[PDB]
Amino acid sequence: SSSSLTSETEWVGYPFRLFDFTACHQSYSEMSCSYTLALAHAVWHHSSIGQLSLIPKFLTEALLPVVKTEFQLLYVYHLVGPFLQRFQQERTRCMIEIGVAFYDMLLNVDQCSTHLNYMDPICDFLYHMKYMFTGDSVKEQVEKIICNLKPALKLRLRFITH
Amino acid sequence: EDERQSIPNVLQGEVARLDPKFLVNLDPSHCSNNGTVHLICKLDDKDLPSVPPLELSVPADYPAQSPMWIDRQWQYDANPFLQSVHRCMTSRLLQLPDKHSVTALLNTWAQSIHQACL
Amino acid sequence: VNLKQAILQAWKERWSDYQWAINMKKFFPKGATWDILNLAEALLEQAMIGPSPNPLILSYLKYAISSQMVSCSSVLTAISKFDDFSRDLCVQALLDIMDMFCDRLSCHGKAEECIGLCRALLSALHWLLRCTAASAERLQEKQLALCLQCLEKTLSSTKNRALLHIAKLEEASSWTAIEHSLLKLGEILANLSNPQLRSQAERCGTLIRSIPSMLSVHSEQLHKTGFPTIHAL
Numbered sequence: 073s074s075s076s077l078t079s080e081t082e083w084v085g086y087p088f089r090l091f092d093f094t095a096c097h098q099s100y101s102e103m104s105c106s107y108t109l110a111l112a113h114a115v116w117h118h119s120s121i122g123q124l125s126l127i128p129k130f131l132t133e134a135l136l137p138v139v140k141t142e143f144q145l146l147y148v149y150h151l152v153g154p155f156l157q158r159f160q161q162e163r164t165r166c167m168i169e170i171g172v173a174f175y176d177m178l179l180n181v182d183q184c185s186t187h188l189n190y191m192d193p194i195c196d197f198l199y200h201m202k203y204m205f206t207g208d209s210v211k212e213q214v215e216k217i218i219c220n221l222k223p224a225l226k227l228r229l230r231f232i233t234h
Numbered sequence: 235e236d237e238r239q240s241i242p243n244v245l246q247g248e249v250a251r252l253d254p255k256f257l258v259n260l261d262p263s264h265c266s267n268n269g270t271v272h273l274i275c276k277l278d279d280k281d282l283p284s285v286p287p288l289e290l291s292v293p294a295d296y297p298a299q300s301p302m303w304i305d306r307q308w309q310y311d312a313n314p315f316l317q318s319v320h321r322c323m324t325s326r327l328l329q330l331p332d333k334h335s336v337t338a339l340l341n342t343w344a345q346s347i348h349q350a351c352l
Numbered sequence: 353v354n355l356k357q358a359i360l361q362a363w364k365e366r367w368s369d370y371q372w373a374i375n376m377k378k379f380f381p382k383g384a385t386w387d388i389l390n391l392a393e394a395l396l397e398q399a400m401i402g403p404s405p406n407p408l409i410l411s412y413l414k415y416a417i418s419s420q421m422v423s424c425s426s427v428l429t430a431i432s433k434f435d436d437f438s439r440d441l442c443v444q445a446l447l448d449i450m451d452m453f454c455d456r457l458s459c460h461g462k463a464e465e466c467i468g469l470c471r472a473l474l475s476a477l478h479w480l481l482r483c484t485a486a487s488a489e490r491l492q493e494k495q496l497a498l499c500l501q502c503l504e505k506t507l508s509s510t511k512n513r514a515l516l517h518i519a520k521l522e523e524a525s526s527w528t529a530i531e532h533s534l535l536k537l538g539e540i541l542a543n544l545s546n547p548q549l550r551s552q553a554e555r556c557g558t559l560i561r562s563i564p565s566m567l568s569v570h571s572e573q574l575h576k577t578g579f580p581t582i583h584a585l
Contacts, residue, residue, distance in 0.1 A: 086576040
């Protein structure tokens, strides 16, 4: 997740076509991060009983001082997102954690960051994160954290803050 | 039995009656059949000339009139006298109950243009 | 030549500025031939105005050219060798009244004459660069910034771009001379006397030197996606 992957990783920066799995349908398009995400999603879906229960704190313990760039944020989204409804089924009491976790990531990708090219994907992703799963639940905790965002992020989520 | 070579002849028979001092032409092709009218007219007569009107009416059913005034935004506010002409023409058109395709609109426009001289 | 005396009388007997065109068309068939149009009106009235703008006449010219011909006005204001005159006052009102051409539109010629309109704008560009010579006052300027800003007002894209392109395809001598004139004008205006000076002027210079290169420069970048075409080929 931090092999080089900070500023001058390579021209491979295009996240959508390669970071998501099933891209390695050819013998080409086979990146190590892709197979790693695939192994992840596998162990995530299989162990979605109690092993996932330690995952929120994990993100709060180790995932803080590793997120530097934005495709790191897209990667950790690929890692965490598609299994949040599993928590929502029984482990709702940690969703907000995951939420603020992602929000914390925003802070990082707000500090060491010049420009955000694919930011609107993250914007609407977090939008449906809030409206489809959490709702008007974590408003007070996120109020004090989103005030530090960039002008574009404010212009995007001025209805999220509402 | 079909025309197949011109617009609805209703407006043709209408415009054939108007005074020869009104010279109507053909605009870029955007009023062929349904809109059927691009009233690009010149008041070539002994009176003072002015900016050609637009006056885009609707299908011959006439649930509307011609005045649309697209190119007016810069054609009217630039000249103060022409701005007064536009004000008079608007005040007259608003007082025209259910104006019509060619006769009413062009007549009101000409009378406002040659009345608001002052 | 009687049109000159008629206009001089219209000045001697000042008009309501709307009966102007009435009395003008009264002296002619008003449609038979307009090759004797205002191509001599503004030049005469301003050259006899000399160190004055001659008010109450330009307003009539504007109320006329609201619906009149425009190629003749352009070729006149381009051939008006006011550099030898350089009163710094008549050219002010001239640019003020000609800004409407770039403001509203450059109308059609309904024939090959429209292509000639291109030529006019071409010379206009050249004539516009002539005001940079007026920038060489060095009184220590005032009107140079105005002429540059109205020149910029003329350089609104998607309007004159193809016109000047066709002008360049007409001949290359005039465009090469225009390029040399732009080089000299940049060398002169390099002495940036104000914040906006030599900044917007540089923008116009880059615009005019870049437009004839290509009008369809597709700058699509970062469009990475599945690229199997050459792969499969």
